[PDB]
Amino acid sequence: LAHSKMVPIPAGVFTMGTDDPQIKQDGEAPARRVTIDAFYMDAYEVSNTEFEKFVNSTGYLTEAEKFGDSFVFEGMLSAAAPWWLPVKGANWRHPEGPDSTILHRPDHPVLHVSWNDAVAYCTWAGKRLPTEAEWEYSCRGGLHNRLFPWGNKLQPKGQHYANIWQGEFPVTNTGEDGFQGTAPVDAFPPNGYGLYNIVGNAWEWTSDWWTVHHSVEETLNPKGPPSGKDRVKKGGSYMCHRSYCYRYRCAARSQNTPDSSASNLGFRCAADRLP
Numbered sequence: 001l002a003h004s005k006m007v008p009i010p011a012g013v014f015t016m017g018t019d020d021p022q023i024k025q026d027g028e029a030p031a032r033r034v035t036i037d038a039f040y041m042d043a044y045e046v047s048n049t050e051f052e053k054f055v056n057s058t059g060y061l062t063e064a065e066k067f068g069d070s071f072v073f074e075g076m077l078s079a080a081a082p083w084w085l086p087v088k089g090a091n092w093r094h095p096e097g098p099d100s101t102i103l104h105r106p107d108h109p110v111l112h113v114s115w116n117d118a119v120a121y122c123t124w125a126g127k128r129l130p131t132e133a134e135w136e137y138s139c140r141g142g143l144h145n146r147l148f149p150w151g152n153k154l155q156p157k158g159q160h161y162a163n164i165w166q167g168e169f170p171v172t173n174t175g176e177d178g179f180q181g182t183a184p185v186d187a188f189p190p191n192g193y194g195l196y197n198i199v200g201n202a203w204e205w206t207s208d209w210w211t212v213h214h215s216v217e218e219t220l221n222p223k224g225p226p227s228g229k230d231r232v233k234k235g236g237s238y239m240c241h242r243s244y245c246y247r248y249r250c251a252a253r254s255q256n257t258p259d260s261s262a263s264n265l266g267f268r269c270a271a272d273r274l275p
């Protein structure tokens, strides 16, 4: 395993957002041309094993551990919606609560990490969170105006390309794609840049404050708005389905307060140069 490896994301110009928004309330529109300097992106979501190295080094206690609870999806039991439950003792080591464990899933994405927990990790690692624009550029994997990192078909060539939901959400996840919950961080094909699970599996924090008001002005290395209350997260998770939550597109976007944590939310890091 080299689950902390980074790939070089080449300098370029891309179309961020879409003029065919699918969730208009989320400010997916308008399409806008953004210039991104070359930088490095983690190939993988940060795994349980990688996060454990950080905690071993620093003694870091996550926000969920200090609060004493975190949000768990009801379908994973042995609020934003009725299927989200605040569970006492749910945290990154205990992803469904105090009687769950990560011992059998060391290579799965770390979960129940807040935006602050993510920043702590990335900075410990000699890295940082990506901006939303960096994240989206990276997600798109060198293709223009596609739905997904790989193109516009959900199952190209009849193959599963990401870990999302199949079946009737929230009652039945068929596990058709091979995973009901998370998958290992190196599961599924990489995109054109070498990135794995950038849509699906775990949601991914970015550095930007959330807004839905964007100009069509062309920008260079944008950082998002200077203030806000929620931070931007991207990419969707193992829970997403076309029927209720169509957010496994590069252009999709959502938000949470920075001290928030949940059983479907993780992150990956970026860097200006190799650490």
Ligand SMILES: *[C@@H]1O[C@H](CO)[C@@H](O[C@@H]2O[C@H](CO)[C@@H](O)[C@H](O)[C@H]2NC(C)=O)[C@H](O)[C@H]1NC(C)=O
Pocket: 049, 050, 052, 053, 056
């Ligand atoms: C984090 O630290 C723990 C505790 O030191 C490590 O687990 C130990 O690893 C040693 C060396 O391989 C074993 O001999 C012990 O039996 C382990 N102790 C326990 C209680 O698990 C762990 O490997 C470290 N984690 C990472 C990812 O580096």
Ligand SMILES: [Ca+2]
Pocket: 163, 164, 165, 166, 175, 176, 177, 178, 179, 180, 181, 238
């Ligand atoms: Ca799945």
Ligand SMILES: [Ca+2]
Pocket: 045, 197, 198, 199, 200, 201, 202, 203, 204, 235, 236
């Ligand atoms: Ca992901």
